[PDB]
């Protein structure tokens, strides 16, 4: 991945190794030059999410203003579990409504 680099932590510009024929990153500040990490370079993406695990409801159990389930806390163990959805501006991000136990925090999904 495109990072900085030791010495003078700074941006890293791309640079091919013609002769050799391999990846190689570098910076415009100093001279440092490290090998590549993958053929990939830049990606577009028109948008298809941006949450995956939205780490991590680690503050849902203490959210007096939230709903709760009843028993069935996959793994861990115990009853009572807070849930909730996402809904961001546009969609249609269906409603991957998730959950979290009060005595744990296992983001146990569900259909």
Partner 1 sequence: GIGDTIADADTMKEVTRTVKEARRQVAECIQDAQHNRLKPEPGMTLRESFEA
Partner 2 sequence: QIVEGKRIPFGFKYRTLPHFPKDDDSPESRGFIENSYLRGLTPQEFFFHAMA
Partner 3 sequence: LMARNTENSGQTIRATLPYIRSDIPIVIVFRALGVVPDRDILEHICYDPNDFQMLEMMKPCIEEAFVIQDKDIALDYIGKRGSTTGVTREKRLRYAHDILQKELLPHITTMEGFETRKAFFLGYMIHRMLLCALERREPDDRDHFG
Question: Residues comprising the binding site?
Answer: 5, 8, 27, 30, 73, 76, 101, 104
Binding partner selected for residue 97 from Zn ion, partner 1, partner 3, none, CB under the kind-specific 5 to 8 Å limit: partner 1
65 near partner 2 (CB under 8 A): yes
99 in Cβ contact with 82 (< 8 Å): yes
Residue 43: C-alpha distances to residues 4, 8, 29, 107 (Å)? 19, 27, 25, 29
Binding partner selected for residue 103 from Zn ion, partner 2, partner 3, none, CB under the kind-specific 5 to 8 Å limit: Zn ion
Which among 44, 31, 36 is positioned nearest to 2, based on CA atoms? 36
Residues that bind partner 1 (CB under 8 A): 87, 90-92, 94-95, 97, 111
């Amino acid at each position: 991945n495109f990072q900085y680099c030791i010495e003078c932590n700074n941006m890293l510009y791309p640079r091919e190794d013609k002769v050799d024929r391999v990846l190689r990153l570098a910076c415009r500040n100093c001279d440092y030059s490290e090998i590549a990490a993958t053929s990939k370079v830049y990606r577009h993406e028109l948008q298809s999410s941006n949450v995956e695990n939205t780490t991590v409801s680690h503050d849902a159990s203490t959210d007096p203003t939230l709903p709760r389930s009843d028993k069935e806390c996959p793994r861990c163990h115990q009853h009572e579990a807070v849930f909730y959805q996402t809904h961001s501006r546009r969609g249609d991000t269906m409603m991957t409504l998730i959950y979290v136990c009060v005595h744990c925090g296992f983001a146990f999904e569900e259909q």
